Short mmCIF file of N, CA and C in Angstrom, two decimals:
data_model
loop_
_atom_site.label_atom_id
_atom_site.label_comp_id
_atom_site.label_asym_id
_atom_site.label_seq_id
_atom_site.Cartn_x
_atom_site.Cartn_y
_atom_site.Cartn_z
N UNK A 1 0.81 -1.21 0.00
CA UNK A 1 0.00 0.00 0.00
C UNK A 1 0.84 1.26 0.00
N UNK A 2 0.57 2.45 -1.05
CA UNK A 2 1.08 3.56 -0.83
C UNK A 2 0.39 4.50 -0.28
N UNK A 3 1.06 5.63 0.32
CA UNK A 3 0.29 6.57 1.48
C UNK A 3 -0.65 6.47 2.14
N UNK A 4 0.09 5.05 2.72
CA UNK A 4 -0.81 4.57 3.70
C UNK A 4 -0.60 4.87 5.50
N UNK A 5 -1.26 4.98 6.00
CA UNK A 5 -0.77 5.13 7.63
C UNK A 5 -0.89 3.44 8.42
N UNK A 6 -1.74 3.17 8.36
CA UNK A 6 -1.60 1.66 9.09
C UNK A 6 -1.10 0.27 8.13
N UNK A 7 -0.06 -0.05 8.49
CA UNK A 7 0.63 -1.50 7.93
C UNK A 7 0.96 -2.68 8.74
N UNK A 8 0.38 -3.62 7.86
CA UNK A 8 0.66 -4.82 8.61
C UNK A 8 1.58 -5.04 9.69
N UNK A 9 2.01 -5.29 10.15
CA UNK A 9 3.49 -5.69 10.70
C UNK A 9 3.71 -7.17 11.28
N UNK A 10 5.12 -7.77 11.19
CA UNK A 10 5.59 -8.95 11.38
C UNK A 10 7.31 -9.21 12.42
N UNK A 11 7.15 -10.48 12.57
CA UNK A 11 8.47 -10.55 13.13
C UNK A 11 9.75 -10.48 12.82
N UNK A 12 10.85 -9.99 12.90
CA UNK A 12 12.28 -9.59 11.94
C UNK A 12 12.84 -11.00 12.81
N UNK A 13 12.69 -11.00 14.49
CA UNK A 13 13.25 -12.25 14.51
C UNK A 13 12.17 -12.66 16.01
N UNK A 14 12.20 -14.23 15.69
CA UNK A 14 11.07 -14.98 16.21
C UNK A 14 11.73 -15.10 17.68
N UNK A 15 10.87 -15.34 18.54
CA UNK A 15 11.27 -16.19 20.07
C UNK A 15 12.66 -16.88 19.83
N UNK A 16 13.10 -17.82 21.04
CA UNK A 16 13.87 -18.41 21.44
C UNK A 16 13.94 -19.28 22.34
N UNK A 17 13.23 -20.65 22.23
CA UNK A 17 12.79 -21.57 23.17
C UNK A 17 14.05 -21.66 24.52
N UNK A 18 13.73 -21.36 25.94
CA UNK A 18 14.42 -20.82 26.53
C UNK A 18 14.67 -22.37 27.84
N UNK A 19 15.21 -22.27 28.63
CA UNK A 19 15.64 -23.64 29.92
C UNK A 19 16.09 -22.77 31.12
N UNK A 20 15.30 -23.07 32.17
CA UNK A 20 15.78 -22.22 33.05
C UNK A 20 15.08 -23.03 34.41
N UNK A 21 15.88 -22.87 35.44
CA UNK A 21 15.19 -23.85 36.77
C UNK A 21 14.25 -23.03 37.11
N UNK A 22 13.42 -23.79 38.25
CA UNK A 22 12.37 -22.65 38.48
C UNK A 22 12.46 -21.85 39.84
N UNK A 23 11.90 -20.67 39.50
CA UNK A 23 12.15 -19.86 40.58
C UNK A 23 13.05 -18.94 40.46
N UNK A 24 13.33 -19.07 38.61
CA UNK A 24 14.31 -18.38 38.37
C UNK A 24 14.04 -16.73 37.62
N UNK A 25 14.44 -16.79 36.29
CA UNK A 25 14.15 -15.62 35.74
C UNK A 25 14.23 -15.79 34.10
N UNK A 26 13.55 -15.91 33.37
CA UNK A 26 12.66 -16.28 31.74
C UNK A 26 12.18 -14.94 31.35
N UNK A 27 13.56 -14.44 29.93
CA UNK A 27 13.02 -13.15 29.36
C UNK A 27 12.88 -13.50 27.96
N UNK A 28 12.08 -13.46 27.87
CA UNK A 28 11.32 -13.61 26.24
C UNK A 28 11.94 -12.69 25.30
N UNK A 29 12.85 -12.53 24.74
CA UNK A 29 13.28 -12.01 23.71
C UNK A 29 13.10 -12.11 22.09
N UNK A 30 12.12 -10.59 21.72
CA UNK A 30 12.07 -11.04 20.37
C UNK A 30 12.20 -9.36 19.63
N UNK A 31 11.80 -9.45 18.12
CA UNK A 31 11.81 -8.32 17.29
C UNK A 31 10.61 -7.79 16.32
N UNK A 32 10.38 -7.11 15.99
CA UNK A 32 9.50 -6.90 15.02
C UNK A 32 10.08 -5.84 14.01
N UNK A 33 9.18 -5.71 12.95
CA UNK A 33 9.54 -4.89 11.42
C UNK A 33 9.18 -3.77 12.24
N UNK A 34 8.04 -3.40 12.80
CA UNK A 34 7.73 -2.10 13.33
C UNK A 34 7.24 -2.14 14.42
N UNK A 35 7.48 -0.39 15.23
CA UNK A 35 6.93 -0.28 16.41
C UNK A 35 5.28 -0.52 17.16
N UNK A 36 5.69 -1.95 17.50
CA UNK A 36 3.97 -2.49 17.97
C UNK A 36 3.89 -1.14 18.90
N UNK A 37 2.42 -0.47 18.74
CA UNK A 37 1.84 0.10 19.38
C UNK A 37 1.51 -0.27 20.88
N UNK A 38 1.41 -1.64 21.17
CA UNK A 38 0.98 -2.54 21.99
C UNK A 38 1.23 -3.67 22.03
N UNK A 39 1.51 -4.49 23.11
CA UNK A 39 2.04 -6.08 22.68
C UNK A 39 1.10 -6.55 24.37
N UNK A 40 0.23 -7.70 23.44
CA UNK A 40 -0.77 -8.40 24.33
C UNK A 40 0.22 -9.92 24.46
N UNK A 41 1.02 -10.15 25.50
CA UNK A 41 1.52 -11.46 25.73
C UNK A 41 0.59 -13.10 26.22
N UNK A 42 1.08 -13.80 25.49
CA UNK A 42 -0.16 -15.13 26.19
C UNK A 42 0.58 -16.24 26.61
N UNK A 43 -0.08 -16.62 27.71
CA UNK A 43 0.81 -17.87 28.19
C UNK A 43 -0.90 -18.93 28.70
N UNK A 44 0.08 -20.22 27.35
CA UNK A 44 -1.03 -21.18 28.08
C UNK A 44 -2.66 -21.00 27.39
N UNK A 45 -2.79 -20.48 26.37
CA UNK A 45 -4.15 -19.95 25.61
C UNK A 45 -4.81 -19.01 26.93
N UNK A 46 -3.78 -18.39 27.83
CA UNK A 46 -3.93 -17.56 28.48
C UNK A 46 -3.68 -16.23 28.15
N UNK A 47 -4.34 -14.94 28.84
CA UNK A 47 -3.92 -13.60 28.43
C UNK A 47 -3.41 -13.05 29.23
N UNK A 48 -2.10 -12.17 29.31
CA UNK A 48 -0.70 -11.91 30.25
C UNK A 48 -1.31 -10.76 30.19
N UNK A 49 -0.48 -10.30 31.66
CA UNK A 49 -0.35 -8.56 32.18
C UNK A 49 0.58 -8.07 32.94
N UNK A 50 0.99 -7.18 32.37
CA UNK A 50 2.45 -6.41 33.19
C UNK A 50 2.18 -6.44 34.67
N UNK A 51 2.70 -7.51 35.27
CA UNK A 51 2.46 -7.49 36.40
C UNK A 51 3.67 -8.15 37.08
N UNK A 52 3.86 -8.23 38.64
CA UNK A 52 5.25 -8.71 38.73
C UNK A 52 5.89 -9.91 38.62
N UNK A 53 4.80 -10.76 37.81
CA UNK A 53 6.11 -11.87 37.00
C UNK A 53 5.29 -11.60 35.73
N UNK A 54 4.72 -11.09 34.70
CA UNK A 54 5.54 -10.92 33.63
C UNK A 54 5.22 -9.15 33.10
N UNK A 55 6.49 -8.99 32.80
CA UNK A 55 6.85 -7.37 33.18
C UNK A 55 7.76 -6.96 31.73
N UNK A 56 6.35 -7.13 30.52
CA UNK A 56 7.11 -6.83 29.54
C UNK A 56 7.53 -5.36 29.15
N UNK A 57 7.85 -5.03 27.99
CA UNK A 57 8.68 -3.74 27.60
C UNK A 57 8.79 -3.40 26.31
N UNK A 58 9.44 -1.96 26.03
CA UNK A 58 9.15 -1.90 24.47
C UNK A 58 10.24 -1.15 24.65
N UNK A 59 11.04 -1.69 23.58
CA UNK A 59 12.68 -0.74 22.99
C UNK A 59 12.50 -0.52 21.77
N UNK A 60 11.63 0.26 20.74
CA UNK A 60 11.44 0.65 19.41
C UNK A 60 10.99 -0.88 19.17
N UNK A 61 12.46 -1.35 18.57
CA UNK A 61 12.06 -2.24 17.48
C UNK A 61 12.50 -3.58 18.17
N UNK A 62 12.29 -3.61 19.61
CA UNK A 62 12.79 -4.98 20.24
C UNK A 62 12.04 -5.21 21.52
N UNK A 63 11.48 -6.16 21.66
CA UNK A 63 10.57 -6.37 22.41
C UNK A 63 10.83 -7.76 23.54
N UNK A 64 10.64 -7.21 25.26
CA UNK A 64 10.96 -8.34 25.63
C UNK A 64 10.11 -8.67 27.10
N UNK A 65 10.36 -9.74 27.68
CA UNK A 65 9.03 -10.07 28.58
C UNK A 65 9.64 -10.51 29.95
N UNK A 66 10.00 -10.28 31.14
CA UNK A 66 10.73 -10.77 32.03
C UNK A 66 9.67 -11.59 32.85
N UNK A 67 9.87 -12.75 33.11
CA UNK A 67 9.08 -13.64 34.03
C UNK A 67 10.21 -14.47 35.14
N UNK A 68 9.68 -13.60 36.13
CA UNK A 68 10.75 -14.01 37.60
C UNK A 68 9.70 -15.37 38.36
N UNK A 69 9.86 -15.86 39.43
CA UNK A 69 9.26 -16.59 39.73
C UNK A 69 8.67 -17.67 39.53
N UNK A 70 9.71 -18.21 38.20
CA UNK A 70 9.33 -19.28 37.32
C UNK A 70 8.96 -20.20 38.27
N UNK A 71 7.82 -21.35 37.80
CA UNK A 71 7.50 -22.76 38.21
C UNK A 71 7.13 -23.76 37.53
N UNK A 72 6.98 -24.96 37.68
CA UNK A 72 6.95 -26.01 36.93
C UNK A 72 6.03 -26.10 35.95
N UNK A 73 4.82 -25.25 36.45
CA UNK A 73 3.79 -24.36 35.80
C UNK A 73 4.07 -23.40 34.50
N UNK A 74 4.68 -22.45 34.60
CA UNK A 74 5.07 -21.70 33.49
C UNK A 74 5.42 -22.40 32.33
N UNK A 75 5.83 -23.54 32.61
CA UNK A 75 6.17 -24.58 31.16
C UNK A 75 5.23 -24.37 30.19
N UNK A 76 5.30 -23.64 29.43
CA UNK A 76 3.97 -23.54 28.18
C UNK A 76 4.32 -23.00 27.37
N UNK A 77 3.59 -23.04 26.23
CA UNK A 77 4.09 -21.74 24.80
C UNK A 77 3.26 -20.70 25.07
N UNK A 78 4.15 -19.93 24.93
CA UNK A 78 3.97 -18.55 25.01
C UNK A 78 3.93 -17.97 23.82
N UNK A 79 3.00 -16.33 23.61
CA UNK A 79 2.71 -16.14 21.98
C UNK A 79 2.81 -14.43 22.18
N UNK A 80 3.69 -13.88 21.64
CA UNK A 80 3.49 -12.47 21.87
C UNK A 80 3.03 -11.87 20.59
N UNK A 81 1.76 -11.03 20.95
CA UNK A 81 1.36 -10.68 20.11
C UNK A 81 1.64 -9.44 20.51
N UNK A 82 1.13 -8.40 18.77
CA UNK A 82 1.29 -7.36 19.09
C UNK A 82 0.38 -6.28 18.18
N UNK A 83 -0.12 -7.29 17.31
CA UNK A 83 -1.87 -6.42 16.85
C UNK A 83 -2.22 -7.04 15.32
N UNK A 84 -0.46 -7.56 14.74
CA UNK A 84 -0.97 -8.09 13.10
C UNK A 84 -0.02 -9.81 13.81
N UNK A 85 1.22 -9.58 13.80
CA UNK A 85 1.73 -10.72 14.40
C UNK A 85 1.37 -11.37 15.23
N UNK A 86 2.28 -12.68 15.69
CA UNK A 86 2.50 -13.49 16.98
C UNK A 86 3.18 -14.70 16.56
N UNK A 87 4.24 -14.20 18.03
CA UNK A 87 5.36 -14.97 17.56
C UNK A 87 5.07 -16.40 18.49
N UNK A 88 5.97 -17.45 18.76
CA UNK A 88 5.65 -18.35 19.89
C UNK A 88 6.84 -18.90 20.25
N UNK A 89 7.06 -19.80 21.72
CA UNK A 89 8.56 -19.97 22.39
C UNK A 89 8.39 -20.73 23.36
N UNK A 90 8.74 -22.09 23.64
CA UNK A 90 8.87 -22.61 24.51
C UNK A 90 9.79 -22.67 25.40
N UNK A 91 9.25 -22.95 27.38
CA UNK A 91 10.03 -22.88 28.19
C UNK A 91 9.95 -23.77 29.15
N UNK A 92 10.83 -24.17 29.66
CA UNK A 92 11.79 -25.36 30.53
C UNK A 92 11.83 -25.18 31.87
N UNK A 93 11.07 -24.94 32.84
CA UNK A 93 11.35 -24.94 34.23
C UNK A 93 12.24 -26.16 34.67
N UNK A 94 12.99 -26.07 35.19
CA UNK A 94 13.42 -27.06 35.69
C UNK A 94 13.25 -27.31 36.82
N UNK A 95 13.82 -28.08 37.65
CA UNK A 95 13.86 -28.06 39.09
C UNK A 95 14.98 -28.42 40.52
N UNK A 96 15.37 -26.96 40.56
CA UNK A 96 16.74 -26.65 41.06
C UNK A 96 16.86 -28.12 42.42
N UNK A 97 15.72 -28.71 42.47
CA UNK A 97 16.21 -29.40 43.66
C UNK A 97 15.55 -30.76 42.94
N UNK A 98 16.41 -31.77 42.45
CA UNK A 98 15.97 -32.97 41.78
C UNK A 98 16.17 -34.30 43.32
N UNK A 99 15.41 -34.48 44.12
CA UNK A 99 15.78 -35.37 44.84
C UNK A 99 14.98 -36.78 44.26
N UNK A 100 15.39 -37.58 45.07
CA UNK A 100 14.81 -39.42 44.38
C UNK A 100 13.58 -39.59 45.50
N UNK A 101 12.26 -39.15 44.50
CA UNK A 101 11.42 -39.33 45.27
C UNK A 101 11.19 -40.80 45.59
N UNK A 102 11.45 -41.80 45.02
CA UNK A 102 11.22 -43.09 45.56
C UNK A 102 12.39 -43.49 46.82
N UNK A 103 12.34 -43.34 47.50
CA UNK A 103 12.69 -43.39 48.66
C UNK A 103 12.70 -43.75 50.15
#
């Protein structure tokens, strides 16, 4: 489209399926062609909110999501959208304390 004001927009570079123990700290790092106006994050066919575990952000053209308090729970794909896109990224809680439950 020429002299246009609203354009599609897409990802320049996608997620990064991430591994991290839990309880730890999972930042979603990604990019887009243009400045999302807004980025609605989802975890789990769930809908995310800047809140204090996930506490995303906007750097122009780079976009990222900090989730502290990871748990065995958070294991899910995650989809950041941002009004034409959505990207997706899987994550790995682990578990900093592996003992032998048969015991």
């Amino acid at each position: 489209g020429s002299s246009g004001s609203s354009g599609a927009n897409c990802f320049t570079e996608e997620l990064t399926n991430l591994q991290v123990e839990e309880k730890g700290t999972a930042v979603f790092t990604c990019k887009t062609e243009h400045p999302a106006a807004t980025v609605t994050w989802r975890k789990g066919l769930l809908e995310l909110r800047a809140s204090g575990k996930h506490q995303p952000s906007q750097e122009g053209l780079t976009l990222r999501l900090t989730i502290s308090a990871l748990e065995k729970a958070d294991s899910d794909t995650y989809t950041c959208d941002i009004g034409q896109a959505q990207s997706r990224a899987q994550l790995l809680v682990q578990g900093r304390r592996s003992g032998p439950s048969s015991g």
